[PDB]
Amino acid sequence: QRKVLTLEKGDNQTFGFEIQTYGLMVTFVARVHESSPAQLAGLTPGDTIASVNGLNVEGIRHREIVDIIKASGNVLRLETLYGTEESQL
Amino acid sequence: QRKVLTLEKGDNQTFGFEIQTYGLHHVEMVTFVARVHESSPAQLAGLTPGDTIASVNGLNVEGIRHREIVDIIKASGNVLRLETLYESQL
């Protein structure tokens, strides 16, 4: 049971988050900046992205998944499986 | 890909790095190397951030949780041996 959400960004600004892909390939949100688009949007560290704009990303190569995200322009659509960053409270 | 590295440091000092552990889904735990302080054994050893710590002193730390990695590192004293796996803003 995932949780979808869409991010709105300014033209010259960025969504404000970073991500990390990892083999065993899987990618999650490693960090979110304050007052960022992703923060407001409610993106959380530890959270896995199952698919961007339908396009299921579960597996893809970093560089590859990166493009799609960047290529999405100033509006992004995400469905995520909750994750957690241990230092977080 | 496993990049081995070994650090040594003294009583009243620290290896110089910080870690982050994520509990993921597809719960899988994963530990990365966060900050790596300047003038630190970790630096000299060439450890680099973003790396996935897969092995600590010969024990496998994947799937293991933060405080366990943290305990295993504390158990060996002034010497530490890591095996790391050889990140983009949006």
Side-chain angles (χ1 to χ4, degrees), chain A residues 3-62 64-89, chain B residues 1-25 27-85 88-90:
Chain A
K3 55 187 160 305
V4 176
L5 73 190
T6 57
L7 295 64
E8 302 244 84
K9 87 170 182 61
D11 191 275
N12 279 292
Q13 65 169 304
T14 66
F15 284 103
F17 61 114
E18 185 197 338
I19 75 173
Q20 283 217 66
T21 312
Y22 142 78
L24 282 192
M25 297 296 136
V26 57
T27 315
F28 57 82
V29 187
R31 190 168 209 175
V32 160
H33 312 283
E34 299 296 332
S35 315
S36 88
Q39 172 181 280
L40 271 305
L43 246 196
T44 264
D47 297 342
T48 279
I49 319 75
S51 54
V52 190
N53 320 305
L55 301 184
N56 286 185
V57 300
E58 279 166 291
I60 305 168
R61 196 289 193 183
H62 186 220
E64 202 111 17
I65 304 207
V66 182
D67 287 316
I68 312 181
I69 300 164
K70 260 197 173 73
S72 222
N74 291 32
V75 171
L76 190 59
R77 195 160 198 291
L78 305 169
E79 329 177 6
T80 55
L81 308 175
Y82 189 66
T84 64
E85 178 166 50
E86 239 63 17
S87 44
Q88 305 309 271
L89 302 179
Chain B
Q1 180 183 188
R2 279 142 178 288
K3 176 176 184 190
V4 82
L5 316 75
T6 76
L7 301 66
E8 211 246 71
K9 49 79 160 187
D11 312 345
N12 304 183
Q13 186 166 306
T14 75
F15 303 111
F17 69 106
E18 292 169 1
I19 62 167
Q20 276 296 178
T21 307
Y22 304 84
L24 316 170
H25 291 57
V27 168
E28 192 77 55
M29 304 294 287
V30 291
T31 304
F32 287 68
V33 182
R35 305 178 204 157
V36 177
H37 308 31
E38 222 63 319
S39 307
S40 71
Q43 183 194 313
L44 277 56
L47 183 69
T48 64
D51 282 297
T52 275
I53 283 182
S55 184
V56 164
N57 303 323
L59 312 173
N60 172 282
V61 297
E62 310 169 299
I64 269 48
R65 68 170 194 167
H66 180 262
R67 60 173 71 180
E68 239 304 56
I69 298 171
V70 174
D71 273 356
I72 298 174
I73 284 178
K74 275 179 167 52
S76 293
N78 297 316
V79 188
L80 170 63
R81 175 178 176 292
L82 305 153
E83 295 199 7
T84 55
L85 289 183
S88 55
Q89 295 294 359
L90 309 184

